[PDB]
Amino acid sequence: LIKPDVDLTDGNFYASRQAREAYRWMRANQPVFRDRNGLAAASTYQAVIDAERQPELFSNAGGIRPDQDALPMMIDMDDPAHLWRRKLVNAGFTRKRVKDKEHSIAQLCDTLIDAVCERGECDFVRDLAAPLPMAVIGDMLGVLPEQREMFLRWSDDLVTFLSSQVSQEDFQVTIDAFAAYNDFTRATIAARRAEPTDDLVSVLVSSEVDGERLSDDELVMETLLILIGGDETTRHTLSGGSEQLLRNRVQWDLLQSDRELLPGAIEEMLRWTAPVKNMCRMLTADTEFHGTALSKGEKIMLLFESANFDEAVFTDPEKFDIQRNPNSHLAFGFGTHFCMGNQLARLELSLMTARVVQRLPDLRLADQDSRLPLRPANFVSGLESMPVVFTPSRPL
Ligand code: HEM
Ligand SMILES: CC(C)CCC[C@@H](C)[C@H]1CC[C@H]2[C@@H]3CCC4=CC(=O)CC[C@@]4(C)[C@H]3CC[C@@]12C
Ligand code: NA
Ligand code: NA
Ligand code: NA
Numbered sequence: 001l002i003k004p005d006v007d008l009t010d011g012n013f014y015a016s017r018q019a020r021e022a023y024r025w026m027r028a029n030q031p032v033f034r035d036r037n038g039l040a041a042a043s044t045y046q047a048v049i050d051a052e053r054q055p056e057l058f059s060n061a062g063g064i065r066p067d068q069d070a071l072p073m074m075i076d077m078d079d080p081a082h083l084w085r086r087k088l089v090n091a092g093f094t095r096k097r098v099k100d101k102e103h104s105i106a107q108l109c110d111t112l113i114d115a116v117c118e119r120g121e122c123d124f125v126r127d128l129a130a131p132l133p134m135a136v137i138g139d140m141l142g143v144l145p146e147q148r149e150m151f152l153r154w155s156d157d158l159v160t161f162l163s164s165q166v167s168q169e170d171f172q173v174t175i176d177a178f179a180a181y182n183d184f185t186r187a188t189i190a191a192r193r194a195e196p197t198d199d200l201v202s203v204l205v206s207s208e209v210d211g212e213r214l215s216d217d218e219l220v221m222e223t224l225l226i227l228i229g230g231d232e233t234t235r236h237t238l239s240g241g242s243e244q245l246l247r248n249r250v251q252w253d254l255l256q257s258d259r260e261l262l263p264g265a266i267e268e269m270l271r272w273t274a275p276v277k278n279m280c281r282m283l284t285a286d287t288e289f290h291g292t293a294l295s296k297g298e299k300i301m302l303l304f305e306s307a308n309f310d311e312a313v314f315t316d317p318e319k320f321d322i323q324r325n326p327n328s329h330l331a332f333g334f335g336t337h338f339c340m341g342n343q344l345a346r347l348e349l350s351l352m353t354a355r356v357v358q359r360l361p362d363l364r365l366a367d368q369d370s371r372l373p374l375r376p377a378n379f380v381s382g383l384e385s386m387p388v389v390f391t392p393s394r395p396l
């Protein structure tokens, strides 16, 4: 095994399909790894957990992304300022409020499958995996159903070109996407100030943190955080997890034969796909961390996918096993910033996967001998496309 020569900010690393071999080297030889440019990364399950449990030393207030300033959103804040924001919107994502959405989310799943069932084929990414979480979080945000496609396109342009090697033409698209989203959302904020609604934008507009109204800048960025959290994450577990079911037919047959295996299947899909490849922390002081000296002010990447394949926690991690138990993956992170939408994501995954294995029972990849492309982006990433085939059925 040769040491990886990699740039962890280069989107191409996360699409090369040699990332997990690079992770394996890190976990065995330098758990807190420094890449070709010296960027520090926590590669082992233990190192990620230890960093998450010490927010006083591993801060979010420097921003969660490499080479990027902190923004006015709660994921870029430390406690208690971060907690004050979480409490404004936590109520919409509790176990009961999520479960009470099952009928509406199930209806969206069937509407989306109704749109492709007569075709006998679709792009599983474009036509099922991406639109379902978009519709769910769009409804909570007050996005009109006919404008979901517009918001998802903005969202895609905001994350799919995150890379130290981004081209000028892709960078311009990211800039233009934020400008359009910013203009639209500021108009939305003014509309909800005149006529409040029950969507999350109106909730944030009507909120106070420590007795102060949220700034218009923060309102735009908190709304965007909720949007991207909803529509650029679950989609990759839906597509990538379904792909592993199709590529490991024993697992697909197991789930089709026993529906009570669905909760465990969802957890293994989450472990395998790890849509959030990394979150950054900024060191507030010099420290020695798992054999690596870290300096105050530098950033360290928490490699969630690397932790999800750590042999110290998972037996035979390269085997897709929907019956894996326990399955304490870190797809949702850990600590005070643990994913607020973890329950909503799991229900999105459960309802769509159950309806896919029900209404597309003979689902297959259009070419089982192919290798599907992954998005070369350094933050969230998954399958770009996924052509599938099935026997047509009639809509419901
Ligand atoms: C498979 C689906 C998802 C994955 C893998 C995922 C992953 C993550 C991760 C890794 C974090 C940071 C945790 C840390 O740094 O320790 C996070 C935070 C967050 N996620 Fe999720 N997420 C998913 C779905 C969602 C959904 C559906 C929403 C809906 C709004 C959402 C909203 C958020 C928010 C607001 C935060 C910031 C929480 C905070 O800073 O306290 N996520 N997510
Ligand atoms: C997956 C979720 C839990 C976290 C979501 C983080 C999103 C909202 C964050 C992460 C990366 C950020 C972008 C970083 C680069 C860029 C510089 C600009 O010129 C303005 C907009 C911005 C485009 C940011 C807008 C939204 C950002 C995308
Ligand atoms: Na790779
Ligand atoms: Na800043
Ligand atoms: Na654009």
Ligand code: NA
Pocket (backbone or CB within 6 Å): 246, 247, 363, 364, 365, 366, 368
């Ligand atoms: Na197949």
